[PDB]
Amino acid sequence: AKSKNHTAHNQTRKAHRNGIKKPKTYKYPSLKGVDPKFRRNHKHALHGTAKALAAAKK
Amino acid sequence: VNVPKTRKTYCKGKTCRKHTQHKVTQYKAGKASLFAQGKRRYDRKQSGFGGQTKPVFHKKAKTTKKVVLRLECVKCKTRAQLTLKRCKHFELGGEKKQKGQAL
Amino acid sequence: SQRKLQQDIDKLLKKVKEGIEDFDDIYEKFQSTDPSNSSHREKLESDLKREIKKLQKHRDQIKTWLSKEDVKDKQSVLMTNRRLIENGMERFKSVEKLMKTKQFSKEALTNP
Amino acid sequence: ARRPARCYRYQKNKPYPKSRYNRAVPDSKIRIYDLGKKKATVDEFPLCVHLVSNELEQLSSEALEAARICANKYMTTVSGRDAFHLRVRVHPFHVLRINKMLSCAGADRLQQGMRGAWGKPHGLAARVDIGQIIFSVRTKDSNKDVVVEGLRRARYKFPGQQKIILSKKWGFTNLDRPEYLKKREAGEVKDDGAFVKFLSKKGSLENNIREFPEYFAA
Amino acid sequence: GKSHGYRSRTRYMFQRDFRKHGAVHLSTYLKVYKVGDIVDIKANGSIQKGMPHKFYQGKTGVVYNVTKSSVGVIINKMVGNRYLEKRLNLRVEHIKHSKCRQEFLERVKANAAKRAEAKAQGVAVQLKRQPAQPRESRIVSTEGNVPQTLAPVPYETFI
RNA sequence: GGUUGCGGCCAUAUCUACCAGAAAGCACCGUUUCCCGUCCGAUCAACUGUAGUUAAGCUGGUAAGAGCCUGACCGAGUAGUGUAGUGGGUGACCAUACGCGAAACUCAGGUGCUGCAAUCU
RNA sequence: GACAUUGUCAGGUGGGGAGUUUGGCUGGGGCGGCACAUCUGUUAAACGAUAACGCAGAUGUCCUAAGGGGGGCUCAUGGAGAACAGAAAUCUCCAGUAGAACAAAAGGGUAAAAGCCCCCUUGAUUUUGAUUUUCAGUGUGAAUACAAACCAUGAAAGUGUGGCCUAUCGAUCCUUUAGUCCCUCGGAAUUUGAGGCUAGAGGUGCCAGAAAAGUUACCACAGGGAUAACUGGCUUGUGGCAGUCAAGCGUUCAUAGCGACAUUGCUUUUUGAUUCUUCGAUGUCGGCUCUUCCUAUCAUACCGAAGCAGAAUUCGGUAAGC
RNA sequence: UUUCUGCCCAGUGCUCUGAAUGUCAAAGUGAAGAAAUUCAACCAAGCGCGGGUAAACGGCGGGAGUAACUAUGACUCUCU
RNA sequence: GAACCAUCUAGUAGCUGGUUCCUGCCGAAGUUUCCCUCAGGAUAGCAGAAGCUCGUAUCAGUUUUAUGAGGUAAAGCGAAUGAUUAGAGGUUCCGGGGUCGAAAUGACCUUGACCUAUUCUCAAACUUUAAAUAUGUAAGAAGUCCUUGUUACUUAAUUGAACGUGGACAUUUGAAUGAAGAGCUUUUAGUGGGCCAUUUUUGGUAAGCAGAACUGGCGAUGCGGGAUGAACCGAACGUAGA
RNA sequence: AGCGCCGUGGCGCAGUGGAAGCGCGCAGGGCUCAUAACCCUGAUGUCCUCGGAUCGAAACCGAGCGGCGCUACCA
Ligand SMILES: [Mg+2]
Ligand SMILES: [Mg+2]
Ligand SMILES: [Mg+2]
Ligand SMILES: [Mg+2]
Ligand SMILES: [Mg+2]
Ligand SMILES: [Mg+2]
Ligand SMILES: [Mg+2]
Ligand SMILES: [Mg+2]
Ligand SMILES: [Mg+2]
Ligand SMILES: [Mg+2]
Ligand SMILES: [Mg+2]
Ligand SMILES: [Mg+2]
Ligand SMILES: [Mg+2]
Ligand SMILES: [Mg+2]
Ligand SMILES: [Mg+2]
Ligand SMILES: [Mg+2]
Ligand SMILES: [Mg+2]
Ligand SMILES: [Mg+2]
Ligand SMILES: [Mg+2]
Ligand SMILES: [Mg+2]
Ligand SMILES: [Mg+2]
Ligand SMILES: [Mg+2]
Ligand SMILES: [Mg+2]
Ligand SMILES: [Mg+2]
Ligand SMILES: [Mg+2]
Ligand SMILES: [Mg+2]
Ligand SMILES: [Mg+2]
Ligand SMILES: [Mg+2]
Ligand SMILES: [Mg+2]
Ligand SMILES: [Mg+2]
Ligand SMILES: [Mg+2]
Ligand SMILES: [Mg+2]
Ligand SMILES: [Mg+2]
Ligand SMILES: [Mg+2]
Ligand SMILES: [Mg+2]
Ligand SMILES: [Mg+2]
Ligand SMILES: [Mg+2]
Ligand SMILES: [Mg+2]
Ligand SMILES: [Mg+2]
Ligand SMILES: [Mg+2]
Ligand SMILES: [Mg+2]
Ligand SMILES: [Mg+2]
Ligand SMILES: [Mg+2]
Ligand SMILES: [Mg+2]
Ligand SMILES: [Mg+2]
Ligand SMILES: [Mg+2]
Ligand SMILES: [Mg+2]
Ligand SMILES: [Mg+2]
Ligand SMILES: [Mg+2]
Ligand SMILES: [Mg+2]
Ligand SMILES: [Zn+2]
């Protein structure tokens, strides 16, 4: 009682029905996987920039 | 394999927190105590009629066990464990290999 | 079935142990023959030869067992039984060479 | 005991040569590939006649040996032993497999059928193409009418269609007849055991003059 | 049984080349990668550390992270019925800059120069590229180019 | 332009055989107290630039040179190949239509270029 | 006679009896094998993916160095030499792009090294995170790149989170070890004991992990033509039959009759191969009986050929009427 | 009915012996502990050891060489 | 080969059979992973429904330009590895024979190897080279340029890195074509036996045989044709007329 | 066909990485009038062939050759 092992028939049609959406990209991507020494400084840099602009347009 | 009886490695003993000397032994499992909760539950379940109530393993397939070294920091007596790969023969005694010797 | 296999494992192991046991008494009685009794000496040689041939056969079966048969648990006792069979084998070999050597043959005359 | 050639006529499988993955093949039945006056010089036999395939198929080594023996015997008997040089320009390297099934009654009781059907080497064949030369024979012009008949007799031992073509080349070379003639009237040819080496304008002038001195003696 | 390892079917892919074996030249280490650069992936068999998987050979991605000896690249992998983003940490020996990106940047600055120039004249720059238009009319003369008549050739053996 | 230090591309740079090399520079070269290393001051280390030599290294040139590199409407639009037909052929396979398109071969040409710093008749 | 007996616990014996089990894949099942967890090359059709009981092989280890760092050197082989010494001992020179070695299978990779020798070492360490492969973007295994420490080596740049890279392995429950010596034992305390938290080990190879022997020719049920044993159908290896060629046999002579080495076919009266139909049944070997059909003709009719004198015989044709 | 029922107790069973460094449960005894408890020693039968038993279950060889023709092998060697 | 009667009992069944009105709209799958899993499930996929945020775009089973990657087809072996045909010229202080020989680091000839230059034929697990078809990315407003602000990161250093302020560059805003609305979420059915055709392709002598790759189909689909046929050719369907 | 075993002196057989032996035969001498028996000695091998791993094996791992034994069932 052998049977079919494997096929890829109809799979591309199934995928291209409502398929091959490219992932939505954004401004400001996620900073995980980035160097922690870079993130730890970028936090302080952004905080200082925000404080400087707030003192500028207070 | 051959592992030396001593090894200089890290010790997280709250006073060392650095690489100190360590005396290396081999880990043995220790006698399984009675009055452990699982043992009490097992005796209670095995008592009476019904026979053996839990599975008992038969289909042994490994030939080896992973060896575990118990390291003893010589300063603060902190003990650590680290496992090695599976080896058939194991040795703590240091008979170091020499290269240019005859058979 | 692994059960039938380990049954014949245990059967051969007890047969090997009693073969070692009735080899060792023949060995010590060979050493205590009082060598004046040369007939009894040769009888003891030919008697332990049969036992070591029986153990040799058992050792070949242990060889095949450790090679192909998937013993799966008892490599240790099969190897220790094999080591005992072979040490009895070289014991018999020392005995049999000691009796086979001749007192004025060239092998005796070169180096005592 | 051998299967008919129609079971292995066509190139259905990839080339399957004897290698370090076979290690157990039957040796080829054809062994001699060059015959006649094989030590004859190049200008002794100008004319070259080819028996060339027209199918993409496989020629068995037994058929090659049979056709070789046929043409050799005919031309040696009715033209002399040393009037031609024949060369088989195919070599059986493809190894034919057979999945031998039992021919007894109740063979299905112990046959297993198509399970593990991978065959065993039992033959050798040469994979030919459209316009691939099978036989090439070089002679003088006084032997043409009989070497054509020898190749025509050898053609019956082969499956498929083969053509007999008179080549415009001088013997077993690659040059045409008048090109070789105008090359050999000068000293830029130099005979070998059976073939001929040519002078090129490339290379060291010392060795080029050491050989072919008649071309440089202008 | 079947075999699908990390380097299955990588025999010719991770071969080095003909006659450029050995160590790699120093420009690969001297090149500077920044976050947002577009880089191509081509693995080097001489460097076994930080290799990409065989799927990413010849793939082009965007840098998102720069480390001591490696580079983080974002690839779009086709899985099922969608693409997923895959973050790869690759040593720079497997990485080269994409030339199409810099050639686009030169086109950008050239278009900027054209616009800044012709803003002073108002001559309708027409900065877009255009495909190969069909060729327009021309008059070809026969002076020294009288047409030479050709004919099909008969069949011949040529062996 | 030569040379030295550090290089980039890594044979147009390599290999084989000869010939030449002002100046300077490199080099060979001379010594073993010291630091140092060897069975061996040969290599390595140190010292002198003194006693000498372009012999070698190195650079350049030569060779119907090998190799390598570039190009060709040289092979060849060939082999192969995407697409099409109720095309051919018993079949094997092969033509045609719209397209893409090699490799070997042959011929011709070439045989390192160049960056930073210093120095030289 | 205070022993037997009787009562309750404890150990042994106990197919006499009770209950249950007695893998999967599979060109039917069984036997065989593992294609069941994995690795290399190929099949695989130049991204990736990709099957068969496809092909050629391999794994359940081994290593305190065969790991890490640094320094020095160059290997296989060949040639030419030197007492004993020769084909092979040790020493010297030249050539040597790797033709060697790198634990193992194969494939990549490596030459002032990744190889060989020497020096020092434990980074084969700690804390958790992110990412790649298999992939459901789950787990496991393996691997990658950083961060925070502590270290090793080296003049230093640097390199080092095991093995140059691709394989070398394991959940819940339970037990046990290490750490915190931290939390709880719930009327309040102290000490044992126990239970918890974090990180490992003890193992499931049918490898995402049941605790498991057979037989039924006395058999039963649910089903299956997803699946065999008849026919039928495709195919024709095998069987049978027929050709083509012509080395030779036939005293002489290839072809009267034959005919090797080869090669092209036909048939479905052989046996296979397959699994399409049929398992809510197509009554299954042979014989008897009875009819018809085919020709690849044994006889009979008429002919042709012969190594046909006659006789007998052999080859072949029209022929299935009988 | 008659005539006979050969060899094998190694295995599997069955059965006889128990002086015992064998194994050896519960109860009991001793030591430690503050106790729960732990560790010892002792430890019946049975296994184990040692005998018997096949009109119990059952089982009851292989290869060479060898006699004035050949054959065969009374005979011999060896494994067992 | 464990009677009969009643009850537990409507015992369980991954298995067989059946499953009751019409019309309208949309519309599949026989594939991935895991399971004592292979006649079944879960999971992802395909499908429906409910919609929600917006209003022509942060698109596309497509091409072009530019730029990568590959190791198949082909080709090659007087290029490596391996296989392989035939001679030629040589070398033996150094293969085996004989001859002249007492022998000689002696001579002649025979035959084997080793080298040189050639020559014939080859490779799924060989290769220098190397396509066609397929395949990745980019073609800008989330962009470019100028100036100078933040940092505990980095540099010898206001040196760079990242994110910024302010200013400038707008409809040819950075190739073509098309967009039928674009994007997003929830929930759930059925399916998880497939089969056929062209082309590539493995096993097999072959098979209406078994097993893969791409695409298109049948299943789920009628219609005209192929007399006849699930798949082929043509063309896909509301009811009618021309 | 599959699986498993075996292949060693003239015959029957052992044989584990530092590496070939047992018995009977065979040869020599002795004893005996002589032959056996007996005594003292000696010799004996392509370890089936081929390749590989190892610094090295008959042994380890592969290719075949030869001979044996087991299975080949449900209809
Ligand atoms: Mg299925
Ligand atoms: Mg499968
Ligand atoms: Mg109780
Ligand atoms: Mg109880
Ligand atoms: Mg059948
Ligand atoms: Mg490549
Ligand atoms: Mg590593
Ligand atoms: Mg029972
Ligand atoms: Mg089954
Ligand atoms: Mg691929
Ligand atoms: Mg190493
Ligand atoms: Mg080094
Ligand atoms: Mg993972
Ligand atoms: Mg580090
Ligand atoms: Mg616990
Ligand atoms: Mg565990
Ligand atoms: Mg599983
Ligand atoms: Mg039963
Ligand atoms: Mg039955
Ligand atoms: Mg039965
Ligand atoms: Mg069926
Ligand atoms: Mg047939
Ligand atoms: Mg036939
Ligand atoms: Mg059927
Ligand atoms: Mg039926
Ligand atoms: Mg029916
Ligand atoms: Mg019916
Ligand atoms: Mg009927
Ligand atoms: Mg007829
Ligand atoms: Mg009896
Ligand atoms: Mg008994
Ligand atoms: Mg008995
Ligand atoms: Mg007790
Ligand atoms: Mg007792
Ligand atoms: Mg019911
Ligand atoms: Mg399970
Ligand atoms: Mg069904
Ligand atoms: Mg492209
Ligand atoms: Mg490939
Ligand atoms: Mg090819
Ligand atoms: Mg080529
Ligand atoms: Mg070659
Ligand atoms: Mg679903
Ligand atoms: Mg589902
Ligand atoms: Mg259906
Ligand atoms: Mg249709
Ligand atoms: Mg069409
Ligand atoms: Mg009409
Ligand atoms: Mg004698
Ligand atoms: Mg005598
Ligand atoms: Zn400590």
Contact E65 A18 (CB under 8 A): no
> Which structure tokens are listed for E155?
């069949």
Rounded to whole angstroms, what are the CA distances from D100 to D15, D16, D18, D114, D118?
21, 18, 20, 11, 10
Task: Give residues 18-37 of chain E lying near strand F (Cβ < 7 A).
Answer: 19-20, 25-27
Q: What is the identity of the amino acid at D176?
A: D
**Residue linked to tokens 């003891």:** C44
- Which distant-in-sequence residues (6+ apart) come within 8 Å of D139 by Cβ? D45, D47, D49, D83, D84, D85, D147
* Order of all β-strands in the sheet with D47-53: D34-36, D85-88, D133-139, D47-53, D162-167
Whether the CB of D55 is less than 7 Å away from nucleic strand F comes out as yes
Sheet-wide strand order for E70-79 = E82-91, E70-79, E60-66, E38-41, E95-97
Find residue B22's DSSP bridge partners: B7, B73
Method of determination used here: cryo-EM
Collect all residues with Cβ–Cβ distance below 8 Å to D162 and sequence separation of at least 6: D51, D52, D53, D54, D134, D155
For residue A24, what is the DSSP state?
P
Question: What is the distance between the alpha carbons of residues C4 and E49, in angstroms, rounded to a whole number?
Answer: 52
Q: Measured at the alpha carbon of residue A32, what is the angle toward residues A29 and A36, in degrees to the nearest 5?
A: 125
- What number of other Cβ atoms are within 10 A of residue E61's Cβ? 25
The backbone torsions φ and ψ at residue D36, rounded to the nearest 5 degrees and listed phi first, read 85, -150
Query: CA–CA separation, D118 vs D66, rounded Å?
Result: 30
Q: What is the identity of the amino acid at A11?
A: Q
Name the nucleotide nearest A27; use CA and C1': I142
Residue D38, class by beta-carbon neighbours within 10 Å (0-12 exposed, 13-18 middle, 19+ buried)?
middle
CA D207 to chain E, closest CA, distance in angstroms equals 32
Shortest CA distance to A22 belongs to which of E82, B22, E37? Answer: E82
- CA dist., res. B3 & res. B9, Å (int): 14
Contact E5, E53 (CB under 8 A): no
List the single residue in E67, E80, E85 with the smallest CB-CB distance to A23: E85
With CB atoms and an 8 Å threshold, state whether B61 touches C73.
no
**Pick from A20, A39, A37, A41: nearest CA to A29:** A39
Q: Which stretches of C69-112 are DSSP H helices?
A: 75-100, 106-110
The total of other beta-carbon atoms located within 10 Å of residue D179's CB is 14
Helix-strand-coil split of chain B, %, nearest 5 = 10, 35, 55
Strands in chain B per DSSP E: 6-11, 18-26, 65-73, 79-87
Handedness of CA E50, E55, E59, E65 (dihedral sign): negative
Q: What string of DSSP letters covers chain D?
A: -PPPGGGS-B--S-----STTT---PPPS----EEESTT--TTT--EEEEEEE-S-BEEEHHHHHHHHHHHHHHHHHHH-TTS-EEEE-----EEEEE-PPP-STTGGGS--TTTT---EEEEEEEE--TT-EEEEEEE-GGGHHHHHHHHHHHHTTSSS-EEEEEESBSTTSSSBHHHHHHHHTTT-EEE-SSSEEE--SSS-HHHHHHS-HHHH--
CB count in 10 Å sphere of residue B50? 8
Ligand in nearest proximity to the CA of B38: 15
How far apart (Å, rounded) are the C-alpha atoms in residues E83 and A24?
10
* The one-letter amino acid at B86: R
**Does E contact D via 3+ CB–CB distances below 8 Å?**
yes
Cβ distance D151 to D135 under 8 Å?
yes
Strands (E), chain E: 38-41, 60-66, 70-79, 82-91, 95-97
Mind telling me how many Å the CA of A22 is from chain E's nearest CA? Answer: 6
Which DSSP state fits C66? H
Number of H helices, E strands in chain A: 2, 0
- From residue B48, give the alpha-carbon distance in Å to each of A31, B36, B52, C32: 63, 20, 10, 60
Identify the bridge partners of residue D164 per DSSP, sorted by sequence position: D51
Nucleotides of F under 7 A from a protein CB: 7-11, 63-66, 91-94, 107-108
Residue type, C55: L
